[PDB]
Amino acid sequence: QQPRPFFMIFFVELWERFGYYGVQGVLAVFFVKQLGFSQEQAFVTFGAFAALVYGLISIGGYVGDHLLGTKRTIVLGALVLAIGYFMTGMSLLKPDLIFIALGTIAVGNGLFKANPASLLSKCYPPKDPRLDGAFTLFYMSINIGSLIALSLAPVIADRFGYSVTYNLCGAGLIIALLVYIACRGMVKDIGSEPDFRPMSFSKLLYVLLGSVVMIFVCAWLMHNVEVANLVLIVLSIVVTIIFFRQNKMFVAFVLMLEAVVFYILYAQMPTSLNFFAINNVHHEILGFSINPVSFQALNPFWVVLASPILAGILSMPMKFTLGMFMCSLGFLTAAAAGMWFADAQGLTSPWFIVLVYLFQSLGELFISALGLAMIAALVMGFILGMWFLTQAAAFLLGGYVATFTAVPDNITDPLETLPVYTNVFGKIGLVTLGVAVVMLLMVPWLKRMIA
Amino acid sequence: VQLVESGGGLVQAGGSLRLSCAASGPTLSNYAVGWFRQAPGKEREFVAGINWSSGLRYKDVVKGRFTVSRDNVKDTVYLQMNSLKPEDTAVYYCAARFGGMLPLQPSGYANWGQGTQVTVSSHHHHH
Ligand SMILES: CCCCCCCCCCCCO[C@@H]1O[C@H](CO)[C@@H](O[C@H]2O[C@H](CO)[C@@H](O)[C@H](O)[C@H]2O)[C@H](O)[C@H]1O
Ligand SMILES: CCCCCCCCCCCC
Ligand SMILES: CCCCCCCCCC
Ligand SMILES: CCCCCCCC
Ligand SMILES: CCCCCC
């Protein structure tokens, strides 16, 4: 059905994402049980980590495009990422390593993330009709790797320790790198322009220096979220006023403020929703005992199933509006399951969290795998900059929001935690319903501006 | 996923026993451990537990008599029972649930030991 380099890219993406979500699924619980962080500390440090891991993606697009070439930057990013995973496994020996290891994952991801997609677009003639389907399968590849990692990582951590799980993430990256090396032939004629000139050792050294410096800057920020907050505050307000001073661009801006809300909500899956499932949900579904942390796997699961269907099955503003209503419903559903459908002991049925994740993953499809491609369509390297910047700000804000659900380590009674989660999840749902409704109010004038 | 209790037995009113719960594969340190007891003709009830981060929960009748503690080098949880009374006579089960909650009902716990018999006899010495 598909070109030969498609399958290489599919499996490289699967394994890289497996490694990343192997870390993401266990990271908040690792902060709490292993480093002894309070839930508030863990939630804000996860917010900072995810902010860096996402805000740095623009660099890697630029480096693959103009400095080293897309194929070289895939190799470099995979190597830095694997190093980061093995470094995170090493930090169970040397705890003071953890932040440097996390910054190495961030920078690794920053270099790697944008590049396989770019490579994939180049495996097909310029408007080959199979591209829509090839990119849907690419997203499903991300989510198969993610599903395996989110399901299995917590089990592995429970039975073998974190060092083994982080090392297995590293291993997933080394097998992605091996699949790339053993299919190098498939992509000999596919790449960006620097890929085909000889490599510039000056630019390679510049990238390695910047990478290292930025590893240290990330480790610092993750250790001191209170100045990351101000760095991103002032950065946002100053790119706010650079933006404001330079009519289809005002559409990209409001679309971005809505993607911000979506990413605040997305940020809850490894933090507040994860601990909600730990604390206030039955850990038994269809008669099987599971690790509650594995519940995060319900999002990629619903994506893997829903993406072909939705591919089969207005324009830009309505799709974003529908995604926002869906995320609203996911949180109102969580709030309702706590308010009305809980046990005497304060525990709620896992089916309610299955529906929460279905809603949230529909929202993801409508908003997240759509905004970037067509925000560009409305619009350039500045908006790519400021888009990844606002999404980093969204993960910082998400960590701060998750802290309203943080449970002191001495609380043991689920009826004591149930009302906290339901208050926060319901207010998140009601605000995101308001936001979705003003989105819908604005959809017509938006659709006109896109003309 | 399989826990083994140890340390039950027969003791005179006012004596002590120490129950221990151990786990096989999963590190017990990620788990709230609750001790339940079934007395003849009654339902399992929550006696006492410790969660994954040293929060404790007790049934009112056993406060100031029972202590739950945790050794996370031996991956083991203890129930020290002092001032034992006849009504403490029961089968004691340890149970394990991931995380920091100790819910009161057996349904909140996925993993269960087989149970040790604790008998407290009103026997005392002759005066
Ligand atoms: C919706 C997300 C579900 C993801 C599904 C889990 C996928 C399979 C994981 C490995 C296969 C099963 O391996 C094992 O099986 C038993 C019963 O099934 C489960 O249960 C046991 O282990 C886990 C974690 O170690 C504990 O949190 C759990 O309380 C315990 O009873 C776990 O899932 C897994 O330790
Ligand atoms: C394909 C050629 C690979 C060249 C790798 C050179 C790495 C230089 C190391 C400089 C360290 C800062
Ligand atoms: C005292 C512990 C400090 C840990 C730092 C270890 C650095 C390892 C570099 C790979
Ligand atoms: C295709 C090989 C890329 C080499 C990059 C190595 C940088 C250390
Ligand atoms: C852009 C919204 C920032 C909110 C700070 C509390």
Q: Among all chains, which residue has been given the structure tokens 């040397």?
A: A94
Neighbours of B73 (CB within 10 A): 6
Give B65→chain A minimum CA distance, Å.
20
Q: Among all chains, which residue has been given the structure tokens 């006492």?
A: B48
* Residue B61 per-residue DSSP state: G
β-pairing verdict for B9-12 and B116-121? parallel
Whose CA is closest to atom 25 on ligand 1?
A155
Distance CA B28, CA A34 (A): 14
**Per-residue b/e over A402-430, b at no fewer than 16 CB within 10 Å?**
bbbbbbebebbbbbebbebbbebbbebbe
Enumerate the domain spans of chain A: 1-451
β-pairing verdict for A288-289 and A284-285? antiparallel
Residue A87's SS3 state is: helix
Identify whether the C-beta of residue A132 lies closer than 8 Å to the C-beta of residue A251.
no
β-pairing verdict for B9-12 and B17-23? unpaired
Which residues of chain A have a CB within 8 Å of the CB of B49?
412
List the one residue out of A443, A441, A449, A439 whose CA is nearest residue A326: A439
Q: Provide the token pair at A349.
A: 């049925």
Neighbours of A286 (CB within 10 A): 7
In A205-364, the DSSP E strands lie at 284-285, 288-289
Give the chain A residue nearest B51 (alpha carbons): A412
Give A418→chain B minimum CA distance, Å.
11
- β-sheet bridge partners, residue B78: B20, B69
- β-sheet bridge partners, residue B11: B120
Answer whether A347 touches B (CB < 8 Å): yes
Distance CA B90, CA B87 (A): 8
- Residue B22's region, left for phi above 0, alpha for psi from -120 to 50, else beta, is beta
Q: How far away, in angstroms, is A94 Cα from ligand 3 center?
A: 5
Distance CA B79, CA B56 (A): 12
Which structural technique was applied?
X-ray
- Write out residues with Cβ below 6 Å of ligand 4: A 71-72, 75-76
Identify whether the C-beta of residue A60 lies closer than 8 Å to the C-beta of residue A108.
no
Q: Provide the token pair at A123.
A: 């495996």
Which ligand minimizes its atom distance to the CA of A400?
Answer: 5
Query: CA distances (Å), A11 to each of A143, A145, A170, A176, A289, in order?
Result: 12, 9, 16, 7, 30
Identify whether the C-beta of residue A369 lies closer than 8 Å to the C-beta of residue A362.
no
Q: Provide the token pair at A202.
A: 């000056």
Residue among A33, A279, A410 whose CB faces B30 most closely: A33
Asked whether the beta carbons of residue B101 and residue A158 sit closer than 8 angstroms, the reply is: no
Give B118→chain A minimum CA distance, Å.
26
Distance CA A161, CA B26 (A): 9
Which phi and psi (to 5°) does residue B69 adopt?
Answer: -145, 175
Which phi and psi (to 5°) does residue B40 adopt?
Answer: -55, 120
Query: CA distances (Å), A427 to each of A189, A352, A444, in order?
Result: 53, 18, 28
Distance CA A355, CA A263 (A): 19
Tell me whether residue A10 is exposed, middle or buried, using C-beta atoms within 10 angstroms of its C-beta: 0 to 12, 13 to 18, 19 or more. buried
Distance CA A97, CA A95 (A): 5
Enumerate the domain spans of chain B: 3-121
Distance CA B49, CA B31 (A): 10
- Write out residues with Cβ below 6 Å of ligand 1: A 151-152, 155, 158-159, 283, 288-291, 294-295, 297-298; B 1, 26, 98, 110-111
Neighbours of A372 (CB within 10 A): 17
Number of H helices, E strands in chain A: 17, 2
Give the chain A residue nearest B101 (alpha carbons): A412
Residue among A159, A280, A291 whose CB faces B98 most closely: A291
Whose CA is closest to atom 3 on ligand 4?
A72
Answer whether A161 touches B (CB < 8 Å): yes
Which residues of chain A have a CB within 8 Å of the CB of B26?
158-159
Distance CA A425, CA A281 (A): 15
Residue among A291, A346, A409 whose CB faces B103 most closely: A346
Sign of the dihedral through C-alpha B5, B10, B13, B18: negative
Q: Among all chains, which residue has been given the structure tokens 């007790």?
A: B58
Q: Provide the token pair at B38.
A: 């079934």
Distance CA A371, CA A118 (A): 16
Give the experimental resolution in Å: 2.5
List the one residue out of B92, B94, B89 whose CA is nearest residue B50: B94
Sign of the dihedral through C-alpha A103, A28, A25, A90: positive
A173: Cβ–Cβ under 8 A, 6 or more apart, which residues?
A: A15, A16, A19, A78, A81, A82, A85
Whose CA is closest to atom 6 on ligand 4?
A76
Asked whether the beta carbons of residue B53 and residue A32 sit closer than 8 angstroms, the reply is: yes
Distance CA A228, CA A234 (A): 10
Angle at which helix A201-223 crosses helix A98-112, to 10 degrees, equals: 130
Distance CA A73, CA A68 (A): 6
Residue A17's SS3 state is: helix
CATH of B3-121, one of 3.40.50.300, 2.160.10.10, 2.60.40.10, 3.30.390.10: 2.60.40.10
Neighbours of A354 (CB within 10 A): 14
Answer whether A280 touches B (CB < 8 Å): yes
Residue among A33, A158, A412 whose CB faces B26 most closely: A158
Q: Provide the token pair at B92.
A: 């004691």
Give A440→chain B minimum CA distance, Å.
41
Residue A122's SS3 state is: coil
Which residues of chain B have a CB within 8 Å of the CB of A293?
98
Query: Cα torsion at A338, A344, A347, A352 (round to 10°)?
Result: -50
- β-sheet bridge partners, residue A236: none
Report the first-to-last Cα separation within chain B, whole angstroms.
49
Give the chain A residue nearest B112 (alpha carbons): A289
Q: Give me the amino acid identity at A116.
A: P
Whose CA is closest to atom 7 on ligand 3?
A97
Residue A200's SS3 state is: coil
Which ligand minimizes its atom distance to the CA of A71?
Answer: 4
List the one residue out of A86, A402, A46 whose CA is nearest residue A222: A46
Neighbours of B12 (CB within 10 A): 14
Identify whether the C-beta of residue A390 lies closer than 8 Å to the C-beta of residue A259.
yes
Which phi and psi (to 5°) does residue A297 adopt?
Answer: -60, -15
Identify whether the C-beta of residue A61 lies closer than 8 Å to the C-beta of residue A119.
no
Which residues of chain B have a CB within 8 Å of the CB of A295?
none
